[PDB]
Design a protein around this ligand. Structure first.
Ligand SMILES: CC(=O)N[C@H]1[C@@H](OP(=O)(O)O)O[C@H](CO)[C@@H](O)[C@@H]1O
Ligand SMILES: Cn1ncc(Br)c1N
Ligand SMILES: Cn1ncc(Br)c1N
Ligand SMILES: Cn1ncc(Br)c1N
Length: 472
């Protein structure tokens, strides 16, 4: 019983807003289930929900590649610059100035796992989860940074989850003792939610006592950094540089020192990585300059014309081919401005099949056709807020840096088999370059042995029979 007169004023607000049907079932509810609905409805402003539904449902460009000033490439940067960025990056780690934010609030709808995507075991000989691989890269990088400071290096690991992934993720991290990181340096927090909206603009009811909600997209990171206390913790620690990435990339160079030292040396607010797009239809965002500003056209939003546009003088090469691999740098100073622009991030509309109560009956039904929409903010929608001179984009090698897990085994791409093959082909490559000989497919190299190919001299001359696993 959370008051009765408060229940009344809340009912007025929703009914005035044309959303009174959320109370249609109140008179047959337990006291617990009533209190659930009251509290959760009180967390949403129904007028604001109408505004969003209206823009989504009744909705109302100069478009060029990024100029050369804002762009760089691992593939053709002066090696003096690559070494200098690497060294400076590593200095910043050794200065305890580098934090990581892992975006891991995804559902993995194409993967159809029961567990968080970061728990998934892609069938490596180690059977290590994506999370563990990433934790060991952090572990290894901390050790590398010690080797040029002679002091302990800490990179705090902020892990952003959704309501659906938060509990299993914390249990997994706990069961694995945080993969050998200090639990005090790993913070698990949660992104926010928005209500799912029917095609007619009506809030959808999951049960007779609960509204259907969904995570607010990876662009919900910003808001969540404030409300979780994470930005505060970063400030306390003296963090100045933050690498943000998606959980699903099994090759991700966590806190990559070249990237950090590149961005810091340019004094950007924001930097981002790309790879050459694989073909016209790859499900990647494209980074470009839109209306004079840095920006991303998401794969779900691009038209055929722009996706298939060819380069004037290279008729089989796409004009727009800087594929977003969700690897971002921010200055800490950028995050200090979140309150000024968080509310300006647009809401992207996705038409979704949302299980709910049929308004009228109460029969909790799984719908056939998309009955409603989910709204999501995207992390990269801050790019057009950022001046070109304070933005930087750097090309990396797909085979070293981007191998996403989108689909279930059996698909044939961006799946557990392509992921394993990419990690094991990278390990063989590194071993062969250090003098090792591989019989033979591929070799898994623990990040604790090598972060990025270093430290493998001990393998010179040794014959390794693939498939193998190099651990301590
Ligand atoms: C909002 C966002 O981060 N979108 C990203 C993200 O797409 P998904 O819809 O999450 O698969 O990962 C892609 C790379 O796997 C990237 O190209 C795209 O732009
Ligand atoms: C010239 N160009 N366009 C996309 C990307 Br990647 C590069 N290098
Ligand atoms: C994108 N933006 N707007 C104000 C400020 Br300070 C920043 N970084
Ligand atoms: C044209 N462009 N976009 C990103 C990057 Br790297 C380059 N060169």
């Amino acid at each position: 019983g959370p008051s009765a007169e408060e229940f009344q004023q809340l009912r007025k607000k929703y009914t005035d807003a044309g959303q009174g049907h959320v109370f249609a079932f109140v008179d047959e509810l337990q006291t617990g289930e009533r209190s659930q609905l009251f509290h959760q409805l009180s967390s949403f402003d129904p007028v604001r929900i109408n505004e969003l539904a209206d823009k989504a449902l009744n909705p109302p460009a100069s478009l060029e590649p990024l100029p050369d000033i804002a762009t760089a490439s691992i593939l053709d940067s002066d090696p003096k610059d690559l070494e200098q960025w690497y060294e400076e990056g590593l200095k910043l780690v050794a200065g305890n100035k580098v934090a990581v934010v892992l975006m891991a609030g995804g559902q993995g709808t194409r993967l159809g796992s029961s567990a968080p995507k970061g728990c998934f075991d892609i069938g490596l000989p180690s059977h290590k989860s994506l999370f563990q691989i990433q934790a060991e890269r952090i572990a290894k990088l901390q050790l590398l940074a010690q080797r040029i400071s002679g002091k302990e290096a800490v990179i705090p690991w902020y892990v952003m989850t959704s309501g659906p992934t938060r509990k299993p993720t914390e249990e997994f991290f706990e069961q694995h003792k945080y993969f050998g990181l200090n639990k005090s340096d790993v913070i698990i927090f949660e992104q926010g939610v928005l209500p799912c909206i029917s095609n007619e603009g009506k809030i959808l009811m999951e049960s007779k006592f609960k509204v259907a909600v969904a995570p607010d997209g990876n662009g919900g990171i910003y808001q969540a950094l404030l409300t979780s206390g994470v930005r505060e913790d970063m400030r306390k620690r003296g963090i100045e540089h933050i690498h943000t990435y998606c959980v699903d990339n099994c090759l991700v160079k966590v806190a990559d020192p070249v990237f950090i030292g590149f961005a810091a040396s340019k004094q950007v607010d924001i930097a981002t990585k790309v790879v050459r797009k694989r073909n016209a239809t790859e499900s990647v965002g494209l980074i470009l300059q839109k209306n004079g500003k840095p920006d991303v056209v998401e794969y779900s939003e691009i038209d055929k014309e722009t996706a298939e546009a060819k380069d004037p003088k290279q008729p089989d090469v796409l004009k727009f081919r800087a594929a977003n691999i969700v690897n971002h740098y921010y200055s800490f100073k950028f995050f200090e401005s979140i309150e000024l622009w968080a509310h300006k991030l647009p809401h992207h509309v996705a038409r979704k099949k949302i299980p709910c109560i049929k308004e009228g009956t109460g029969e909790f039904f799984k719908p056939e056709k998309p009955n409603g929409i989910k709204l999501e903010q995207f992390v990269f929608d801050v790019f057009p807020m950022t001046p070109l001179e304070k933005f930087a984009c750097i090309e990396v090698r797909r085979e070293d840096e981007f191998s996403p897990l989108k689909n279930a085994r059996g698909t044939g791409e961006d799946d557990p088999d392509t992921s394993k093959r990419d990690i094991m082909s990278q390990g063989q490559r590194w071993i062969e370059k250090a003098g090792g000989i591989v019989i033979t497919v591929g070799v898994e190299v623990s990040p604790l042995i090598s972060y990025g190919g270093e430290g493998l001299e001990f393998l010179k001359g040794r014959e390794i029979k693939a498939p193998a696993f190099i651990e301590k």
